[PDB]
Amino acid sequence: ADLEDNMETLNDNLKVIEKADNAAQVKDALTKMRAAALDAQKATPPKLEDKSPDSPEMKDFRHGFDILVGQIDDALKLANEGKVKEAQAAAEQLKTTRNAYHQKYR
Ligand code: HEM
């Protein structure tokens, strides 16, 4: 990963969800989100670079990727069923973990 490109891509996919009037495009974008989260989980966050080497939190800063990717799977389960709307609604919930959790770790 770099990190920059994975973070912007997680954002870009959320932007696609604000437009995509069909479960097709909502899902195709959200797929790229999952890929970017997977690679971001393989990156080192500067907010916690000076951390302890083996800090049990840093090691598990991953918790946000686990929580976020969890909610991405649930959101994908909406549009994949055809609830493209409810996917777009719950996309606002993904924004807490990019806003709140960003304060901790960003
Ligand atoms: C929908 C979920 C998320 C979105 C869309 C998002 C988006 C972004 C964006 C745009 C940036 C910085 C781009 C820039 O200023 O050039 C960023 C940076 C960052 N994010 Fe997120 N983020 C998300 C979730 C998360 C989560 C959950 C974590 C931690 C588990 C995290 C950790 C970070 C870190 C460390 C950076 C700073 C790296 C840098 O300066 O580029 N993000 N994110």
**Rounded Cα gap, residues 73 and 59, in angstroms:** 23
Residue 93: how many CA atoms within 13 Å on its side-chain side?
14
Domain containing 32: what range?
1-106
Tell me the residue type at 8: E
If you ran DSSP here, which 8-state letter would residue 27 be given?
A: H
- For residue 4, count CB atoms less than 10 angstroms from its CB and return exposed for 0-12, middle for 13-18, buried for 19 or more: exposed
CATH number for 50: 1.20.120.10
Rounded to whole angstroms, how far apart are CA atoms 10 and 12?
6
Residue type (1 letter), 29 = A
Residue whose CA lies nearest to ligand 1 atom number 29:
64
Q: Decide: 50 in ligand 1 pocket, CB within 6 A.
A: no
What are the phi and psi torsion angles at 32 (to 5°)? Answer: -60, -30
Q: How many domains does the chain have?
A: 1
For ligand 1, atom 39: residue with the closest CA = 4
Burial class from Cβ neighbours inside 10 Å (0-12, 13-18, 19+) for residue 92 reads exposed
Residue 90: alpha-carbon gap to chain centroid: 12
What is the torsional sign of CA 96, 4, 43, 9?
Answer: positive
